[PDB]
Amino acid sequence: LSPNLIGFNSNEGEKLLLTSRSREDFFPLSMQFVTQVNQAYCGVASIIMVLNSLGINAYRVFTQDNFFSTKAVIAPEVVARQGMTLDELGRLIASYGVKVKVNHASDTNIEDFRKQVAENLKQDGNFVIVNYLRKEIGQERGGHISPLAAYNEQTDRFLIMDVSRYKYPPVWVKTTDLWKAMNTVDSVSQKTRGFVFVSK
Numbered sequence: 001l002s003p004n005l006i007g008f009n010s011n012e013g014e015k016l017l018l019t020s021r022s023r024e025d026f027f028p029l030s031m032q033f034v035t036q037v038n039q040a041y042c043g044v045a046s047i048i049m050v051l052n053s054l055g056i057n058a059y060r061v062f063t064q065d066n067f068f069s070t071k072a073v074i075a076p077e078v079v080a081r082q083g084m085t086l087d088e089l090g091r092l093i094a095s096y097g098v099k100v101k102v103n104h105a106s107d108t109n110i111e112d113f114r115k116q117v118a119e120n121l122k123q124d125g126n127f128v129i130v131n132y133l134r135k136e137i138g139q140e141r142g143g144h145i146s147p148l149a150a151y152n153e154q155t156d157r158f159l160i161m162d163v164s165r166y167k168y169p170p171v172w173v174k175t176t177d178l179w180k181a182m183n184t185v186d187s188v189s190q191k192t193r194g195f196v197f198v199s200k
């Protein structure tokens with residue numbers, strides 16, 4: 001990992017969870033944590049984690065293999081090649097009748113991101129998924145999607161539950177770096193990246 005990130009797979013990373021007071025969502029999300037089934041499915045993995053964490057009925061559970069079994073929003077063949085945009089992520093979640101608030105970085109700011117997300121992370125029954133450019137947080141890749149689990153107030157870092165579990169552990173990222181990474185233009189959408197709030 002680049003030195004600006006603190007891996008959850010370290011004593012320091014564990015301590016950031018232990019000293020966080022905005023960490024409720026870590027529990028149900030970790031309980032549903034999955035590895036993206038292929039290199040393009042980060043958004044699908046993120047969605048099914050959140051849907052299962054919310055208790056959404058599809059035992060009747062969501063799976064990356066059953067998610068598209070919704071197709072009218074975006075075809076699985078398109079997602080397999082290109083992933084999904086922030087707006088497509090919103091619509092895919094909404095296709096199962098769940099409430100979504102999509103926040104493009106261009107329409108908000110770092111202070112409101114931090115405040116609203118930190119408050120959300122204290123609450124069960126709702127969740128946050130981020131869409132960000134990996135290069136901007138010191139990681140390898142283009143645009144990625146994963147849920148957020150916790151916020152450490154002392155260090156101003158958010159815990160990303162990275163669904164690329166074969167490649168990276170969950171990481172604690174500085175708010176400033178995560179903001180910079182969301183405040184990037186996705187060439188597919190020609191819109192900024194950002195974050196989504198998900199609730200019943």
Ligand SMILES: *C(=O)[C@H](CS)NC(=O)CC[C@H](N)C(=O)O
Pocket residue numbers: 036038039040041042043082083084085086131132142143144145186187188193
């Ligand atoms: C994760 O597996 C995929 C890899 S392409 N990423 C996304 O679905 C986000 C894609 C979107 N266009 C972006 O660039 O942020």
Ligand SMILES: [Ca+2]
Pocket residue numbers: 025119120121122123124125126127128
């Ligand atoms: Ca929450």
Ligand SMILES: [Cl-]
Pocket residue numbers: 034048062063064065
């Ligand atoms: Cl799965």
